[PDB]
Write a protein that binds this ligand. Structure first.
Ligand SMILES: [Ca+2]
Ligand SMILES: [Ca+2]
Ligand SMILES: [Ca+2]
Lengths: 172, 172, 172, 172, 172, 172
């Protein structure tokens, strides 16, 4: 019986905690991706930095969610964070495709939470996601799509050369 | 027949003017609270300043509402501003609880107006409240709840000592 | 039985609280005037700003009075603030005439309070009004009289043109 | 089959492209208005600058829309841009009235697109319009209404004098 | 019967308005080119920026023409702006070739207008085109020719790699 | 068969990955502690900040470990991160005691890894822990012990008052 709680559905409270878990899992996946591309036998510095920056973005994500949960009088419930689906992430096109699929999964969870908040008439939640999450995901999915198009353009039997040039001239 | 008016419901226009009155009443209540704690026999400077700052925040509230009313071609209708419910506000926990109840009443009016604007399909109104009012109230209600928890922690037979320390070390 | 109270008449204490109400009502009237001239079908920006600045001056008025009331060991008693006498204020000459009448009413209340303080031998009150209120009202009534003379000079069948030029070149 | 497209209705995609056309047409109309008032036999510099600035605002409008269309995986489809409805725009009140009607038409298209996005459950679109378009149009329609009120105030047999003074003292 | 008009042929006046239309159409074509290369499945940022900058150059073109038309006492007559000939512009060599053909068409119209002005003995027009248009087109056509030569040099079965390197190292 | 690997035991490689998991779990526990003390019904800002800073310190811990793992030609193997042992952490003495026990567990794992590296004759590992981890833990355990002593000193029936003063004057 939180003293500050006002028109904050338990369904929304639970869905927020599930989204916190998904973002924790996403940060952990990008941690693994970043350190895989820091391996001596992969050695793509710009790719590692790209995924390491995303792990921090996902970290700021669930931290913002947890701040909002407390602002609204909800209660954070933390669950186990599943390990990444892969230990080895292959080459840069395979890794970017996995990151693309992850961000789309996060985007679908955000849109479902917005739809839940609308059904429960929670405008603070809906505007909170609109302000901090929805456009961020749209922009990131666009950038990953641009990267995948250029990587496909740089494909073929010169794929290794293309991988090097992409890291050097697009990702630094 | 305002020349600029476009998809601005009379129900919304009236509800905005009622919310202007509620904010005028809220500012007036915080005026009384601020000067009560400036009394020589109460003498809690940080508490007076806390409530005096809120009276200004409520003032910027109804001024923003009145600006929006004119932007949308609505017409401000001013009614009498009721006096505060109390002349003497007791001790700091009692005053903070009254301020908490006031902000929750304002928040409920904001959420009802948002629900009205959604039913009437008024997205400018809905985004206007989301941008300027809804998060402000959530943040303020959270801060008041934090204050009440610390005041309860500082309660007991040392309540006067606790009241002094709260004003000195949390509210300045 | 305020510990600090020294030669502060209850008649003066009551008259101060009545003057606080009159100043609250005056600020509220100038709020309505300012937003009336911000309407799209009135659209006189300098006139709105002129009255909006006066609402703040009246606000600093009753705040100074309430500070003095506490300094002298008196107790603020807040009453309902009556709405403005008009919802629509006509043209700039009609509005300035109403503001003139309001300031004269405030001035007469100030002079009556000074006369009461003199009869009750309250020199702090009398000097307080002399220092902060009496000259302010004399100056403001003079400026409004100057505005009304120029508005009458700019009257006639070119009144709309005169109203525009007054707002542009005198009031900004 | 855009790789990035996620919950972006084809109805919304088409409506965005239609709104891009309406904004292209609006910019073109304000181009004509600006250069009409730069004619030697009209010669109202502030009026020309007012409409020339609006043509740029409409340009930033459809550019923002086209950026969003690509961000969401939609595809821009450009159609012919219709010429302005008039070659000669009369006097400043007639021109401002036409600009008013144009902005109201744009506002109605924006509100219809928002209603479509809500029906299709597209919160990124709805917040995109709320953030960048809806308040901009409300503010602009208010300013045009203010201009029309002052122009009507400056009307009568001194209309030419009023037109000159409006351009000199309001529009520069 | 413009009061300022002096030795300004109606044939020249009409030809200027036709050139204004051609420049409006050219800007619109470069708008489409710029946003096509901003698509996620094309994703060539330097190419999009190259064509977006040209749309602004064509915009400054017809604005200069319209300013001159008013300076000489001519009257702007705006017609419908035809949509671009293509919705999809293929790869960078195909797009640059289309932009090349467009600039050559604009250059031929400029040279024809200069020839008309010479036949009509209009030295202000002829020098106006010489100062602001003719060298600009010669320089731009040269740069596009340089780009096409390098793109052809970077062709072959490594065309995708060549396209990426051209955008990265020549166009940014 | 990493090309760079030189005298890096598989036992050490595995123990490093286990320590990475323990540090990930430690950061997650301090995340929960920080947001628990940000709850409206706990409301101890300095305590939340204290634990939030520690979550970042543990984050820099496993990041340093993962960097070292790649430097030595080892391979990171990520496992599931267990949730914190508690959802609610009680009062500040109970939370500090849990953080104390956690840091001692981390310290014991560090000392065991150092002992393993010494047995396997891995001086880079041993100096790496000495330089970056061992003194950090000794300092932190000392500070927590100091906090617990002061919290016990501030205990008794004035425990709530003591909790407030500790947060205000030691932890900010
Ligand atoms: Ca919104
Ligand atoms: Ca005196
Ligand atoms: Ca020449």
């Amino acid at each position: 019986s939180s003293q500050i709680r006002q028109n904050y559905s338990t369904d929304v409270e639970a869905a927020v905690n599930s989204l916190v878990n998904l973002y924790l899992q996403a940060s952990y996946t990008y941690l693994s991706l970043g350190f895989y591309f820091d391996r001596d036998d992969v050695a793509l510095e710009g790719v590692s930095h790209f995924f390491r920056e995303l792990a921090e973005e996902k970290r700021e994500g669930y931290e913002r969610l947890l701040k909002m949960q407390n602002q609204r009088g909800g209660r954070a419930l933390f669950q186990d964070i599943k390990k990444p689906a892969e230990d080895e992430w292959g080459k840069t096109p395979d890794a970017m495709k996995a990151a693309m699929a992850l961000e789309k999964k996060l985007n679908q969870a955000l849109l479902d939470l917005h739809a839940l908040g609308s059904a429960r008439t929670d405008p603070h939640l809906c505007d909170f996601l609109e302000t901090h999450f929805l456009d961020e995901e749209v922009k990131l999915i666009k950038k990953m799509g641009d990267h995948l198009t250029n990587l496909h353009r740089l494909g073929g039997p010169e794929a290794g050369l293309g991988e090097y040039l992409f890291e050097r001239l697009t990702l630094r």
